[PDB]
């Protein structure tokens, strides 16, 4: 049996909960694989100790979802000593870190694509719902719930949703912007604060870097009898799709957990086996990186998910 070690940065991150369950299903389907998977509890020091234990257990490959992307070098040094390949996933290491080890790879996404898709989606629905322009000024007055500062996905999604709207000729006015750390309850608290402050009556659209935060904003809006205010997210979590159906969420963007899990597993198993990382697959590895496309989701294409 081939042991593959996996660390998830935090098991109850909504998106990574989808990913980790999908990786488990891929490993279950492979009778010659034993998956050893750990919750790093959002602490890189815990993750580093977990990696020492996996290496002591003789894993033949590691799939590592970093707590801190800057720790890629620490992880590579541990793996290099045992000649163990590492497939990083979802939290992207630096190019220099990836280039420093011939058996380091990365599976994730092109972060800016999700911001562009989210902006193009907001533009489509704004055009179709001009009653959303509450002050009738032709500009979107928005609030934005940001992910973890410095996370590539949060930074790109925040920058490019606005750039895409503005590039399409839709002026935007930022009424509030703050992190809610990718968390539903923190986002509900932040949105409730904004609905209790002087810009409450001016908010026309809520933009969130992920669905967990969008769902918190949806809850705060319901509590203030403002469910007419549209909310946009990213991930297309199974639970978020239900709100797209009900109209509680105006739109989101599929972050393709099943294919990111599959590519992570396929590459780790090939490397454990001493094969080329993409051998026998159709994964496109570009300079040791696989990026899985995002897809915009709303009521019009909801049935396809
Ligand atoms: C977007 C998810 C993410 O990267 C992230 C990172 C760090 C944290 C930290 C906390 N606390 C210290 C409470 C909460 C959520 C996080 C999400
Ligand atoms: O669901 C898993 C999570 O449970 C929480 O109760 C712990 O505080 C986290 O460290 C852990 O990652
Ligand atoms: O903090 C991220 C996630 O943590 C989980 O424990 C909670 O159930 C989610 O509601 C939350 O979004
Ligand atoms: O100020 C009180 C408010 O705090 C927020 O954190 C909660 O999400 C709301 O439910 C609550 O009404
Ligand atoms: O229905 C959703 C679709 O709407 C289209 O207009 C957008 O261009 C797509 O990105 C999106 O997937
Ligand atoms: O690294 C974890 C993060 O990955 C992606 O950015 C997901 O969109 C987000 O939901 C998740 O919190
Ligand atoms: Ca307006």
Author numbering: 2 to 306
Authors' account:
We determined high-resolution X-ray structures representing the ground states of the two major spectral forms: the glucose complexes of the Blue ttGBP.F17C•Badan and Green ecGBP.W183C•Acrylodan conjugates. In the ecGBP.W183C•Acrylodan glucose complex, the ground-state carbonyl is coplanar with the naphthalene ring and emits a green color when excited, whereas in the ttGBP.F17C•Badan glucose complex it has twisted ~30° out of plane, and emits a blue color upon excitation. The fluorophore carbonyl is coplanar with the naphthalene plane in this complex which exhibits a Green emission spectrum. i The carbonyl hole is formed by K92, E149, and H152 contacts. In ecGBP.W183C•Acrylodan, the carbonyl hole is formed by K92, E149, and H152 contacts. E149 and H152 are located in the C-terminal domain, whereas K92 lies within the N-terminal domain. The H152 imidazole Nε forms a hydrogen bond with the glucose 6-hydroxyl; the Cδ atom forms a van der Waals contact with the planar carbonyl. K92 and E149 do not contact glucose, but form a salt bridge across the interdomain interface in the closed conformation; the K92 Nζ forms a hydrogen bond with the carbonyl. Instead, the rings point out of the glucose-binding pocket into the solvent and are each wedged inside a narrow channel (“aromatic channel”) formed within the interface between the N- and C-terminal domains. By contrast, the dimethyl amino (DMA) groups of the fluorophores in these two structures point into solution and are isolated from the surrounding protein. Consequently, these rotatable DMAs are unconstrained and adopt their relaxed, planar conformation.
We installed thiol-reactive derivatives of the naphthalene-based fluorophore Prodan into bacterial periplasmic glucose-binding proteins. Glucose is bound at the interface between two domains of ecGBP. The protein adopts two conformations that interconvert via bending of a three-stranded β hinge connecting these domains. Glucose binding stabilizes a closed conformation in which the sugar pyranose ring is sandwiched between two aromatic side-chains and surrounded by an annulus of hydrogen bonds between side-chains and glucose hydroxyls.
